[model samples]
Target: MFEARLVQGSILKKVLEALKDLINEACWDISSSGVNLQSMDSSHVSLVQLTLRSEGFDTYRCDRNLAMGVNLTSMSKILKCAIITLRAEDNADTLALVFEAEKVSDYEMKLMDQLGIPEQEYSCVVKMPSGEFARICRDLSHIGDAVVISCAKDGVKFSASGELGNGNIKLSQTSNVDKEEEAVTIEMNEPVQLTFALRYLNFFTKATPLSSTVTLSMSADVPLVVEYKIADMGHLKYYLAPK
Candidate 1:
């Protein structure tokens, strides 16, 4: 038997919202450790990796390793509400999703080649509030197809230029927060500049609802790593190649 329970249903909702646009079908690997998924989009320009640890769930149990192929659209439709318990029996074809129930109940539901993800020694790592990052991406997305992220000792800037005009957002290390963790922090080994597709970056911002803070690990000529933390859970990572 395999079972996992998520206390917050919205986390799964936000996860699906962020991934469904990029992938139609996904294979989930369940083990004693946790659940893991890694998939690239159809275009191969971007990749998403998800990790949900067993400790994040209210209760998690796996007798043995199991691989389940899921139709994202179908699964998402049934997952419209909060999920209390998710389980699947060994040799069972259908997966079960249990929501709030008066008693223990089970509802039957219909549900990766290891790619060498390079160890990126990023020159700059920026940690900022997710709402700020999301707003910046959403606002600049209207200006152009690409966003130029320039990081220097002074600060970091996001700029987009198009036939219409140019849009820029400049953010510096803020020390005005009541708490250090709430402040925007940028750490840099050296100044670096990179350009990425605005659309792809915007797609990643869909995870804003899941995390209050987002981290950007960037280096020259390397894929930019955008991470959204899920509190006690693991994290959702997005890797987008430079345009």
Candidate 2:
């Protein structure tokens, strides 16, 4: 038997929204420790990794390890409603979800190998408020199909150009006197520039509401890593290949 309770249903809702845009079917591995899912999109242009620790839940129990295949589209639709209790019985084929409707309802619900993500250090790491990052992506996406991320000693910049026009967003490092939480920080070992699809970035922004801060790790001609923290639990990471 397995059961988990999440105090905040919105968290799960946001997670599903962030994933459904890239994947339709997902296999969730559940254990006493937590639930984890890692898989690349069908096109193989991007990777998504999610980790939700058992400790993050109000209550969690698992007798044995299990893999649950979920249809994200259906699950996402179901999740639009408030859910409080998620349970599954041994040998059961479907998940039982208790909605906040004061009623019990039954609902149904890998590894990225080849990605040998380099051992070489990243060229630039940018840390900023997630809202800011999402806003930049949302705005630039209107101008082009791709976004160019350039990082230098001074700051980081996002630029895009298309038939509509050209748009650029430059963020400089905050002074030491600025409050840490609100400050934008950029660390660079060397200047690096890379271009990635705005479509995937917009997909990643779906997670913006889940975290207060977002971190971007980039290197020339390499996959960009965008990560959003899930408070004390863990993080959701998205890797988008360069265009």
Q: Number of the top candidate by TM-score? A: 1
Error of 2 at 200 (Å): 0.7
Identify the runs in model 2 with alpha carbons over 4 angstroms from their true place.
101-120, 176-178
lDDT of each: 0.85, 0.86
What's the residue-level lDDT of 84 in candidate 2?
A: 70
How well is each residue in 1-243 modelled by candidate 1, as lDDT tens digits? 898888787777778887887778888889999988888878888999999999999899999899888877767776764547888889877889888725554567675116848775889989888998999998898898999999875678999999899998999887768975577888899888899998888888988888889999988888999999887889999999998
Instruction: Report how far residue 232 has shifted in candidate 1, in Å.
Output: 0.6
TM-scores for all candidates: the values are: 0.92, 0.90
Q: After best superposition, candidate 2 residue 70: deviation in angstroms?
A: 0.6
Model 1: residues >4 Å from true position, as ranges?
101-106
